[PDB]
Ligand binder design. Structure first.
Ligand SMILES: CCCCCC/C=C\CCCCC(=O)O[C@H](COC(=O)CCCCCCC/C=C\CCCCCCCC)COP(=O)(O)OC[C@@H](O)CO
Ligand code: HEM
Ligand code: HEM
Ligand code: HEM
Ligand code: HEM
Ligand code: HEM
Ligand code: HEM
Ligand code: HEM
Ligand code: HEM
Ligand SMILES: CCCCCCCCCCCCCCC
Lengths: 35, 31, 288, 28, 28, 213, 38, 159, 213, 159, 288, 35, 31, 28, 38, 28
């Protein structure tokens, strides 16, 4: 199932990127009680 | 290894399309 | 050749392991590919592209020992119900793309399994199969769904004949152990060229390994290197290859209903979000 | 290419429906 | 070529879901 | 009045009060859905799984034909099995992404390590679902996959063969294996995953979400 | 200015109506599945 | 945007905040905003995608089982590629079994190992993050490796 | 310290406090055990039931032989099946006696009527367990019993035949019936009885026992 | 004997007592007295009796199913004797089905019917008790009836 | 007779419904009982008591028409492995209780199914079977457990012979419809007694229903009452009867282990109650 | 299963008797909050 | 109908034996 | 006659259970 | 007069020991059941 | 008759054990 594997890799990389982006976004501008 | 490429590029790419779209609606309503 | 598979293996080209009997004589291993649409509607003509690539400007050893090019051949196993499209149902460009291919069924009442070749290896680096999909509506033994396709492709001459004896397109080896003494070519004008290689001593011994002409040589004189020593070099430059794929015999109603459902879902989602937006206002009018 | 066109028309259609409904509900 | 529309559908739901989730909760 | 009827007895209002007392903080982004999406995939498996128990026959002579029968003869069976095949992969994928979100948000650290552990267990259970399910069709792939995985435990020196013999119900793979695997796939794993999901969710609802970053 | 009582139920009906639609749509094939083939 | 701030004048909340909790006492109201209006979107979205995939790419039916015929090209599902690559490559079987068991057991130790640090943001903990990314890379690497032949399984047909 | 470890996070003490806050009043006599004994019988069924799924084969060609195999070849199988045969009857009996104690102590009156209803449902579920179980051996009695009960719903004028056709998976009794019945006996009923027992117990633990006489 | 009286000076308890609850706030302590020391006795007792019965009177294995041979003397289990007696005796099948359905459905109505009265003790409600005993008698009667041949099934071979 | 069952039904006396072929000729229905111990240890002799009760001072119609008593007969199907105990393994009182019974197996290699009779019905109101239980330890085809036992007992003469023709121990009926005119007994000195009954008119007709002698008569002269009119009365006073039961081939180890377990349980229960009693004290020292 | 039927009838009658006895016992001497 | 009788009489009767026994122990300890 | 003891066992557990339950909670 | 700390644990051990006995006794045959016949 | 004797001896035995243990624990 190539489609599956493509979905896996795509969603994995996208998710990881999104998570690190979400982390960085809070890193620069800490929300209230940020920490 | 062609279906895999499509699946990868699209599954990775269309997320940003949906995202941008959502932001676009948000901007359209004015939040 | 593809027909020697019929001869040696009448019932089916594929073994229970999925190895394809073609490999029993073409002992080399070169790549092979089969391409088909991901989905096809019933009663539809479509393209199935076999690919049997190899260095075009690379020649092989001929039966006599010469240096001739190489032909391609292949067996393609399609799902039940699938077959070559009638010449009348094939469009112009496709018909032109196919060429003078002689698609040959594996046996009576097995039109889904198709033999091909020998074809010229320079022009048929890839082989187009014009295939007509079955129709579950008119054939109640056929159902919509996903099905496998099996390719067994080959280029170059084989190494073993149907009779059992070997050919002049593979390495030869010694017998036991003893001094080699001769390098000749006792050729007749009735038969072709050979090569003499003797053995002696160690335990009497006076046996000769007369081998065909075609391969190279990396043995000069006076040695004894077990039994299995590569003394002829490998002249093969082709080889057999397999590839499997999947195809979906798709029902359009199945698709359009799905589309409808998706649209409904998106509508519902939208309405829910709108409602939330409506509530966001009401809640904002009760802050302070 | 074809699927891309279809994709654009599809999302554009539903996007239009969204922006339509929001203003339809808002300004009424 | 209904199949193409078929896949486009999948793509469009995948996109639209993220879009609506995002718009819904002022997304991220 | 119905609300009064229920409130008089079970203090229903106690529930609504608890649900509406909960708030979701700003740092909760879309990736916090992944857990709930992993669940959504499981409920689908439970529905479609259950459905296939009404036609599937866990015998070496009956299984393959029964799968065919679901695909070719049963109404929408092809859709049910297809959903069951896809949503399983999706469950595992969404679980992995859930783990990513958990780790890269440090939600596993104190005081939520039991949730993490129960999560790991849940993961092992889900992989078990996958593996056992894979062989039920009793086609070539399933049989030869089971035949490979069943033999692994033999490497353990003292009790490996016992474990393997328990897994396949004997020294070789056959009907006993299919039976035990079907029992495992349709009885044991559902109850186990249920229990550990219950614990997972109870602990999460107890402690709430981890803090911001 | 502010949505009255009636306008809320309209959006409720609009949303949960469509959701019910999707529920039934999804639930319909499952019922035909459980009815055995003739 | 519908937002309730933390009531830091309430000892009960502070006591939870000190304990690493109470984070569900502030923000937008969970009900109805998220639970009633957004969760369904996610559910229907998921179901919709799975249905679309199921229709467009339905399940196949392989050939019946033959205990006397070992298949060529025999793999498990993707999420077992890394484990599968380990088990066939490592010569010592028990070692491989331990390495397999190391995955879930090691993961169980993660929380206790990283309790040293209190941080949550990956950027405020680069050692763990480095080790995590490394792990992920090795995992995907092994995963892809599982598909290649044993000859070029580790080298991946490169070096 | 472990208690501190758990208490720091899940407030374990909250549980112990709740368990020890409960008291049992003087009017609670031995017959108040009957409910808890009905449960004890079910847990036995769950254990022995589960066990038999590791050897039983739900096919018209495999079932009877598999039951024999459990009785004659499997270690202690005869004991497991015997327990499963007895403890089922005992469950039903203890349930009836439980109902007697409930009725003749007026514990069903307000505000505990939902408990009574859930109880009735539970009873129907237990009888269903019994009926479906009875036919799994696929011996003469089981087959002819199923063949009789399956036909009853046909009396309903509009949707009887549909119901029956759903029950037996067709117009006649055969493999489909056995399949559906086995699914029902080993999947559906367990989850249903679980849910309704959960509700039963939650409501009871919520409201406590009825008053004295 | 280890006993705590009801605290009637606590409005919270009185509020429950008025509602027909709070009866688990007084008496002997549930833990450890009953739960830890007596419940196990009941469990082990039950299990012991079932095991003894299973050993002394194990399960039988009947003859294999023959769809072309209808057995003589074919009954369900005891708890279905009354229902079985009804279904075969009543000529109108639908009537019998309704009568069967009347059992659980009727039982569901019991609480709502007897909410007229607040009493619990059977002696303080003799109508209901009479109807109950009557029901029980009819039930056992039908039950026994199920075993007799259809000729003497109702008369029970007496009158 | 029990052997006519062998003759007419060689493979087995029991039909798939469990009816026992004996009923195909003995059409009456009288009670019958089989009693055996609830459990038996392996390799043990025990009693299986058949009961075939009937009014002792009540006679039946003989073949010739006389009034003779009636004999009893029975078929008993025991579980696999069970058989009649060797004369040497039977004790004195039991041996005396059994009598001169000639237990006869239903066929070669079926010693568990045993035919009995005809025996004197006055002395054998009940028939004792001395049976030896099998031993799972020495016979690996035998297992401990619960098993069924099937009785098929009978008293009195049958109504149908193996050839098909009826007998003189059942009712006879008319043919069609017409005036009866004769009541005689055209008896030979070679054959026995008969009874003549004629028919006429309505549609010609001159047929006679010559019936055997033995039954009574409730028809005098000049009538025509369809076909099936009871004119002979039922002389039968016996009948066939079935009874099934169960027996447990029990393993003593199975029992004694259970006993041990029970004792352990009771011990544990006792200790728990004692502990509670211990706690009752501690709690009482913290009341006020 | 005669044994089962015997157990059923015996336990049923015993239980009913015990319940009515328990009711009567409280009928004559009402416990605290007896009613 | 002999096993049924035993079962009935004993299942009904031994309850009172157990009961009386319990009471006897209670009296022996002195509650 | 171990079977007799076998049944006696059942009877004795049945009795003893009630006995211990009763003695335990000052039974009824 | 009054049972000290040590005397409680004795009865605990006595009771729960036997109970454990019964648990193992009951649990033992169930394990042999799941091990397949040779 | 035999089973009755066994029953009496059985319950008597365990009753004796009970009354034994209680006093053994009490007066020590
Ligand atoms: C103080 C006075 C106490 C009196 C005690 C009397 C004890 C009698 C013992 C005599 C005896 O052992 O006889 C055997 C067989 O008997 C038996 O088979 C009699 C049946 C015993 C069953 C009684 C049931 C007891 C209650 C159990 C409660 C269940 C709890 C469930 C909770 C959930 C002989 O076998 P043989 O000889 O084979 O008899 C059978 C054949 O005739 C069968 O046809
Ligand atoms: C089943 C699928 C097969 C395919 C597609 C195939 C293909 C081919 C092709 C294309 C050639 C000619 C190549 C050239 O002239 O350069 C060839 C020749 C040959 N094949 Fe096959 N083959 C198949 C099976 C077999 C079998 C079953 C045998 C023997 C049992 C065999 C043995 C040989 C030999 C010995 C030659 C060359 C003989 C000569 O040159 O005198 N191949 N094959
Ligand atoms: C079927 C498998 C699983 C399901 C259905 C599931 C479900 C959930 C759900 C619904 C939540 C609520 C928060 C959220 O979604 O972000 C959650 C939180 C959490 N999960 Fe899982 N999970 C699964 C597996 C796992 C695994 C494999 C891990 C770790 C390896 C894990 C660890 C955690 C932790 C630590 C939290 C709380 C984190 C925080 O409070 O910020 N779970 N899970
Ligand atoms: C109550 C829960 C479940 C039940 C009752 C259930 C039931 C079934 C049944 C009856 C089959 C046989 C039909 C077939 O072979 O397609 C099956 C197959 C399968 N199951 Fe499930 N299942 C459940 C949950 C799951 C989960 C959670 C997973 C993975 C996360 C899973 C993975 C699979 C797979 C991979 C197959 C075979 C796939 C195929 O046939 O192509 N199942 N299941
Ligand atoms: C926008 C969508 C979602 C978000 C933002 C989200 C996030 C969260 C958060 C922050 C929690 C913590 C709960 C707490 O602090 O009390 C949680 C828990 C949980 N969620 Fe989700 N999730 C989403 C989707 C879903 C869906 C679709 C489901 C089920 C269909 C689901 C089921 C659960 C469950 C079962 C828990 C267990 C913990 C609890 O009950 O508090 N979630 N999720
Ligand atoms: C498997 C079936 C059942 C189980 C396991 C069960 C279990 C229980 C348990 C443990 C209790 C606690 C009190 C006690 O045991 O006396 C209870 C109470 C109760 N049960 Fe059931 N029960 C079942 C069926 C039923 C049925 C059939 C009914 C009515 C027809 C019912 C109605 C009630 C009521 C009304 C109470 C509370 C009475 C009070 O508060 O005094 N239950 N049940
Ligand atoms: C998780 C719960 C249960 C499971 C998994 C289960 C499983 C099974 C299995 C695999 C069989 C076939 C073996 C056989 O025929 O003996 C069976 C038979 C049976 N079951 Fe269950 N069971 C459960 C609960 C129950 C309950 C609660 C009852 C009744 C209250 C019951 C009544 C029966 C009966 C009467 C049979 C056949 C009896 C016989 O074979 O003589 N089961 N069960
Ligand atoms: C002397 C033994 C027993 C007595 C006196 C008894 C009586 C009771 C009483 C009075 C309640 C009401 C609970 C409340 O007011 O909170 C109850 C509930 C319950 N009991 Fe029992 N029962 C006994 C045996 C058992 C056993 C052996 C079990 C399980 C093995 C059990 C399980 C339950 C359950 C699950 C409930 C649900 C209601 C709740 O949790 O409060 N009982 N029982
Ligand atoms: C299979 C078990 C059977 C048993 C135990 C049995 C028993 C007996 C007995 C005891 C008698 C003599 C009674 C007396 O003289 O008063 C008898 C006679 C007779 N039996 Fe049977 N019988 C059996 C089967 C059959 C069969 C298979 C047939 C015919 C096919 C049959 C037909 C008759 C007839 C016609 C007589 C009397 C014939 C005459 O008196 O000339 N019975 N049987
Ligand atoms: C009288 C019992 C009939 C049981 C029928 C079982 C049918 C199989 C599907 C399970 C349905 C169970 C519903 C019980 C309410």
């Amino acid at each position: 199932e190539p489609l599956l594997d493509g979905l896996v890799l795509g969603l994995v990389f996208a998710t990881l990127g999104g998570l690190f982006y979400a982390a960085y976004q809070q890193y620069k501008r800490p929300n209230e009680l940020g920490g | 290894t062609e279906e895999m490429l499509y699946a990868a590029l699209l599954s990775f790419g269309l997320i940003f399309v949906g995202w941008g779209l959502g932001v676009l609606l948000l901007k359209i309503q004015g939040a | 050749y593809p027909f020697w598979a019929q001869q040696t293996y009448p019932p089916t080209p594929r073994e229970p392991t999925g190895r394809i009997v073609c490999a029993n004589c073409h002992l080399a291993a070169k790549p092979a590919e089969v391409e088909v649409p991901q989905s096809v509607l019933p009663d539809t003509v479509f393209k199935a592209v076999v690919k049997i690539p190899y260095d075009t400007k690379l020649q092989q050893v001929a039966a006599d020992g010469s240096k001739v090019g190489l032909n391609v051949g292949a067996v393609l196993m399609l799902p039940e119900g699938f077959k070559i499209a009638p010449e009348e149902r094939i469009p112009e460009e496709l018909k032109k793309e196919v060429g003078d291919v002689y698609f040959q069924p594996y046996k009576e009442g097995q039109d889904n399994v198709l033999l091909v070749g020998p074809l010229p290896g320079e022009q048929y680096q890839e082989i187009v199969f014009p295939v007509l999909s079955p129709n579950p509506t008119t054939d109640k033994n056929i159902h919509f769904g996903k099905y496998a396709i099996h390719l067994g492709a080959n280029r170059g001459r084989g190494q073993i004949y149907p009779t059992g004896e070997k050919s002049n397109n593979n390495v030869f080896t010694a017998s036991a152990t003893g001094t080699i003494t001769k390098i000749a070519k006792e050729e007749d004008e009735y038969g072709n060229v050979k090569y003499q290689v003797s053995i002696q001593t160690d335990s009497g011994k006076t046996v000769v390994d007369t081998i065909p002409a075609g391969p190279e040589l990396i043995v000069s004189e006076g040695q004894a290197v077990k039994a299995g020593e590569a003394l002829t070099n490998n002249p093969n430059v082709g080889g057999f290859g397999q590839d499997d794929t999947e195809i979906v015999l798709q029902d359009p109603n199945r698709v359009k209903w799905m589309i409808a459902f998706i649209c409904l879902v998106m509508l519902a989602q939208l309405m829910l979000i709108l409602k939330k937006k409506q509530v966001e206002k009401v809640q904002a009018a009760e802050m302070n | 290419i074809l699927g891309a066109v279809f994709y654009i028309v599809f999302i554009a259609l539903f996007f239009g429906i969204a922006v339509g409904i929001i203003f339809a509900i808002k300004s009424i | 070529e209904i199949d193409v529309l078929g896949w486009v559908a999948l793509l469009v739901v995948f996109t639209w879901s993220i879009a609506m989730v995002v718009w819904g909760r002022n997304g991220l | 009045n119905v609300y009064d009827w229920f409130q008089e007895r079970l203090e229903i209002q106690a529930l609504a009060d608890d649900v509406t007392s909960k708030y979701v903080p700003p740092h909760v982004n879309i990736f916090y859905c992944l857990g709930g999406i992993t669940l959504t995939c499981f409920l689908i498996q439970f529905a479609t799984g259950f459905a296939m128990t009404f036609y599937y026959k866990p015998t070496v002579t009956e299984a393959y034909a029964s799968v065919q029968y679901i695909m070719n003869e049963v109404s929408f069976g092809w859709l049910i099995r297809s959903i069951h095949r896809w949503s399983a992969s999706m469950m595992v994928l969404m679980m992995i992404l859930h783990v990513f979100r958990v780790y890269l948000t440090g939600g596993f650290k104190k005081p939520r390590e039991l949730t993490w552990i129960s999560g790991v267990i849940l993961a092992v259970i889900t992989v078990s679902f996958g593996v056992t399910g894979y062989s039920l069709p009793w086609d070539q792939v399933g049989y030869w996959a089971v035949k490979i995985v069943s033999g692994v435990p033999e490497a353990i020196p003292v009790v490996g063969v016992l474990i393997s013999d328990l897994l396949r119900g004997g020294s070789s793979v056959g009907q006993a294996t299919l039976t035990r695997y079907y029992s495992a796939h349709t009885f044991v794993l559902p109850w186990l995953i249920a229990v550990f999901m219950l614990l997972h969710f109870l602990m999460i609802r107890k402690q709430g979400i981890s803090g911001p970053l | 200015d502010v949505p009255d009582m009636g306008r809320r139920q309209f959006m409720n009906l609009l949303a949960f109506g469509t959701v019910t639609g999707v529920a039934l749509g999804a639930l319909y094939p499952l019922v035909k599945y459980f009815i055995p083939p003739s | 945007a519908t937002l309730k701030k933390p009531d830091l004048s309430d000892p009960k909340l502070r006591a939870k905040l000190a304990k690493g909790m109470g984070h569900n006492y502030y923000g937008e109201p969970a009900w109805p905003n998220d639970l009633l209006y957004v969760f369904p979107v996610v559910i229907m979205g998921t179901f919709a995608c799975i249905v679309a995939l199921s229709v467009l790419d339905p399940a196949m039916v392989g050939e019946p089982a033959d205990p006397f015929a070992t298949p060529l090209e025999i793999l498990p599902e993707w999420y077992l590629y890394p484990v599968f690559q380990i088990l066939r490559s490592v010569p010592n079987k028990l070692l491989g079994v331990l390495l397999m068991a190391s995955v879930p057991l090691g993961l169980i130790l993660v929380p206790f190992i990283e309790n040293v640090n209190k941080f949550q943001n990956p950027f405020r903990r680069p050692v763990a993050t480095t080790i995590f990314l490394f792990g992920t890379l090795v995992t995907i690497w092994l995963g892809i490796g599982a598909t290649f032949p044993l000859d070029k399984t580790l080298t991946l047909g490169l070096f």
